[PDB]
Design an enzyme around this catalytic site. Structure first.
Site, PDB file in Angstrom:
ATOM      1  CB  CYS A 108       7.006   6.481  -5.109  1.00 39.88           C
ATOM      2  SG  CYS A 108       6.103   5.183  -4.244  1.00 39.88           S
ATOM      3  NE  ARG A 111      10.476   7.224  -2.776  1.00 42.82           N
ATOM      4  CZ  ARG A 111      11.353   8.218  -2.864  1.00 42.82           C
ATOM      5  NH1 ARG A 111      12.576   7.981  -3.312  1.00 42.82           N
ATOM      6  NH2 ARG A 111      11.007   9.462  -2.511  1.00 42.82           N
ATOM      7  CD1 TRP A 280      -1.042   0.141   0.269  1.00 37.87           C
ATOM      8  CD2 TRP A 280       0.008  -1.802  -0.102  1.00 37.87           C
ATOM      9  NE1 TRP A 280       0.067   0.098   1.085  1.00 37.87           N
ATOM     10  CE2 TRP A 280       0.724  -1.087   0.880  1.00 37.87           C
ATOM     11  CE3 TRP A 280       0.474  -3.066  -0.492  1.00 37.87           C
ATOM     12  CZ2 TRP A 280       1.884  -1.583   1.468  1.00 37.87           C
ATOM     13  CZ3 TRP A 280       1.631  -3.559   0.094  1.00 37.87           C
ATOM     14  CH2 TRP A 280       2.319  -2.819   1.065  1.00 37.87           C
ATOM     15  CD  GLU A 285      -2.447   6.546  -5.150  1.00 38.66           C
ATOM     16  OE1 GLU A 285      -1.888   6.435  -6.259  1.00 38.66           O
ATOM     17  OE2 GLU A 285      -2.324   5.705  -4.243  1.00 38.66           O
TER      18      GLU A 285
END
Ligand code: HEM
Ligand code: HEM
Ligand SMILES: Cc1cc(N)nc2cc(-c3ccc(OCc4cccnc4)c(CN)c3)ccc12
Ligand SMILES: Cc1cc(N)nc2cc(-c3ccc(OCc4cccnc4)c(CN)c3)ccc12
Ligand SMILES: C[C@H](O)[C@H](O)[C@H]1CNc2nc(N)[nH]c(=O)c2N1
Ligand SMILES: C[C@H](O)[C@H](O)[C@H]1CNc2nc(N)[nH]c(=O)c2N1
Ligand SMILES: [Zn+2]
Lengths: 411, 410
Positions: A108, A111, A280, A285
């Site tokens: 991720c 983070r 968000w 992506e």
């Protein structure tokens, strides 16, 4: 055993000692690396060791290691395990656990935000209708009229594995996908299997290109049930491009809230099989993966066409050129509509700062380079030249197989 | 142990058994993966012969003479030579096979579909740096081939006792010089600032320009290295222009056509070849993405974007990505316009998938290092991105070795 990582663009070297606290295996053996592999039932026997490890970790973080409150909690958890085979987390421990599950998520890039997670305790939930209500409130809270806020909703934990709570959707908000008889796909090709499951369970599909899927919710191991998210709770952004007025005429849009719902949360040996969490979007992506991937919406062709690019030879880099344009459009549309989004340059910069801070104050930051590096322009982001150590820390978010492959059906 | 890799764009799944032959170790452990670490990479008659046996075993299998006449004879013949000489010499045929299979095993190399077409120059009769120089010039000329590039390797004498090492001190045969500034940062190429100093500090007369081809620093039999200038007529260069932007040539950019890595170590059957420069042809992104845009490198993105009048006020406008694509369009355009071989990252990665396909079919596997195979731009629109890969070390192999100036007993 201290290990070093080097940033080959700044010659910054950091020392990892946190990997010593690693327990779960990585998949890589001494003679083979599975670093690029996507995916590399529990008794009282092994549970108290896992409970003790988590509780030690917890009380260390609150500077009460070895206090009376710490020992009494271990005692209390011991007795509940031997007599009831499981145990219950306190609210304080559930929130710590869920935050650290995100903190440990080595794939991720977002983070830096890990400590600002809003944790919604849904462990009193008992029915699919109750799940639906908890998820609606999560969506409303997290969306916040575009000013997105990170949240997780945690449904009752697994017990004998036969009464699981499962959200059958992979994300709370996703677009349907319909295989046409001519082989083409209408909508999101990524969701064709789930869409058919929904239709089979009785969903009346509008059969459009951007249909929000229903929720398919399993409580206490029962058969799942369908619910329609109220449309006023689904915030969507029409995609337009700042310079190209023809871009809107592609009629693309995307939802604002990324909320992943198919993953398992492990805290102190307890498995929370239903734990939707949301943040968000990072712009790539949507722009790179959701639209241009060969197994997704596949709009590169039409974009390159309307741009009037040399599409005859790939060495014109028309694919690269269209992708940048689509990603400018995504960022422009969300910013214009005041919906939280982050570009891959800001997000990777933030993560390096996070990572250095985690090495400073924690002694490590588990990081999966194959996932942290953005899927476009990789080397002009600061994480490309950053060496990373991947290892598994608990609490953790884990993969779990799709429920329809495992569920025993009631009828 | 009989592992499988999935492509998530096609659902194709390949079974890997070649990994069971993996000799060397990866630096990963069960508790921690190091797949993104850049560098985890004086022998004896004891370790030497098994290394020789394993090489000769796979060599005689490859020619379908396993367990034969010549196979056994060569095995004892080498066994006799090792016991008597504390080393052994490779037949020409084994030397070629050894070099072709080191390329084939290079798990970080996207262009390995070409592995079997390598031209191997045996320079083991070399004794001096001047001789080294002659061999390298001939390599350069052969490989450049007027822009019609040809893969090639030149193999100097193998290490014996580590005091007699042949070394090419350059990291590449052809590289632009780098000069630190008394005022700001760097002119020329920042990657080569140290080496450019070691050249001057060894004798070189630098024209202190922006695109000064470095001289060769060649070390024979462990002697002190010698400077040699590559004849300019043998260094093919491509001036960089753009097919739409007239102002692009005004940036005064150029790049050389031949990528020729010279600081790696070739290991065959336990023998170490410390000087083995090898060359192919560039992928577009290796010049325009890495060599021109990194903060560790030329960093000209600043000025390309300015000359495009893009909104550089916020990162979210993706001006770096826009300028990045234009630079790489220009590089490809320029090389192709001048008929110098180059490959774009879409073509090379599609070629590599087909190569993977072939290696799993006819060999059982293909070690691959996703971190390095995926191009440094537009990663997810190339087919290697959705391709699971398995990374393991096979031998013969190319290996990293310390820079000689930290090692050479001067
Ligand atoms: C708030 C802003 C956030 C951003 C911008 C962000 C961004 C990302 C991105 C880009 C990925 C890679 C996935 C892909 O690109 O396909 C990822 C992975 C992941 N994120 Fe985050 N994320 C955010 C918040 C969160 C939160 C709130 C959680 C959980 C509480 C979370 C948990 C994870 C996990 C578990 C993964 C990897 C899953 C796996 O192992 O496959 N993230 N994130
Ligand atoms: C013929 C065209 C070739 C192409 C297009 C090509 C392409 C590439 C690329 C893109 C990389 C990654 C480096 C980077 O991007 O920074 C690489 C690495 C490498 N290439 Fe190839 N290459 C070619 C020929 C060769 C040949 C002829 C050899 C040896 C005989 C070779 C051996 C290697 C090795 C050993 C590495 C990585 C070294 C390491 O482990 O770090 N390549 N190549
Ligand atoms: C909170 C959050 C915010 C955000 N902004 N983003 C997020 C992305 C993921 C995520 C996790 C795993 C993923 O992978 C799924 C998968 C597994 C195996 C095969 N295919 C696909 C993907 C999609 N890649 C996204 C999870 C959470 C995210
Ligand atoms: C024959 C060939 C052709 C080509 N077309 N391309 C090639 C690129 C490399 C290569 C090897 C290692 C590299 O890594 C440099 C490094 C490693 C460790 C520390 N500092 C710097 C790089 C540049 N990234 C390129 C090697 C050979 C190549
Ligand atoms: C940190 C990382 O291992 C290192 O920067 C690698 C990443 N991937 C790369 N990939 C290629 N092709 N070339 C490189 O130099 C690098 N650098
Ligand atoms: C095979 C490979 O590991 C797989 O395609 C991964 C690579 N890296 C990724 N990185 C991100 N952010 N998202 C992804 O879905 C993937 N997919
Ligand atoms: Zn690994």
């Amino acid at each position: 055993r201290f290990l070093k990582v080097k940033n080959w663009e700044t010659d910054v070297v950091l020392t990892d000692t946190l990997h010593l606290k690693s327990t779960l295996e990585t998949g890589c053996t001494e003679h083979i690396c599975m670093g690029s592999i996507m995916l590399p039932v529990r008794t009282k026997d092994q549970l108290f060791p896992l409970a003790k490890e988590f509780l030690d970790q917890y009380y260390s973080s609150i500077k009460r290691f070895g206090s009376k409150a710490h020992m009494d909690r271990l005692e209390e958890v011991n007795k509940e395990i031997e007599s009831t085979s499981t145990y219950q987390l306190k609210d304080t421990e559930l929130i710590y656990g869920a935050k650290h599950a995100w903190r440990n998520a080595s794939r991720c890039v977002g983070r830096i935000q890990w400590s600002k997670l809003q944790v919604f305790d849904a462990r009193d939930c008992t029915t699919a209708h109750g799940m639906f209500n908890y998820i609606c409130n999560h969506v409303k809270y997290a969306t916040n009229k575009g000013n997105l806020r990170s949240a997780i909703t945690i449904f009752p934990q697994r017990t004998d594995g036969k009464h699981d709570f499962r959200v059958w959707n992979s994300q709370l908000i996703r677009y349907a996908g319909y295989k046409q008889p001519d082989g083409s796909t209408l909508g999101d090709p990524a969701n064709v299997q789930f869409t058919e499951i929904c239709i089979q369970q009785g969903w009346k599909a509008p059969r459009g290109r951007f249909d929000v899927l229903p929720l398919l919710l399993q409580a206490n191991g029962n058969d799942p049930e369908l619910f329609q998210i109220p449309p006023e709770l689904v915030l969507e952004v029409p995609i337009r491009h700042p310079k190209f007025d023809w871009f809107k005429d592609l009629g693309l849009k995307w939802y604002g809230l990324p909320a992943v719902s198919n993953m398992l949360l492990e805290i102190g040996g307890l498995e929370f099989s239903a734990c939707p969490f949301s943040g968000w979007y990072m712009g790539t992506e949507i722009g790179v993966r959701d639209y241009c991937d060969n197994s997704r919406y596949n709009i590169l062709e039409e974009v390159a066409k309307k741009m009037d690019l040399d599409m005859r030879k790939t060495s014109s880099l028309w694919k690269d050129q269209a992708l940048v344009e689509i990603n400018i459009a995504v960022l422009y549309s969300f910013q214009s509509d005041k919906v939280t989004i982050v570009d891959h340059h800001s997000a990777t910069e933030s993560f390096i700062k996070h990572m250095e801070n985690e090495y400073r104050c924690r002694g490590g930051c588990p990081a999966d380079w194959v996932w942290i590096v953005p899927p476009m322009s990789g080397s002009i982001t600061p994480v490309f030249h950053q060496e990373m150590l991947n290892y598994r820390l608990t609490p953790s978010f884990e993969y779990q197989p799709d429920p329809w492959n495992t569920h025993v059906w009631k009828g």
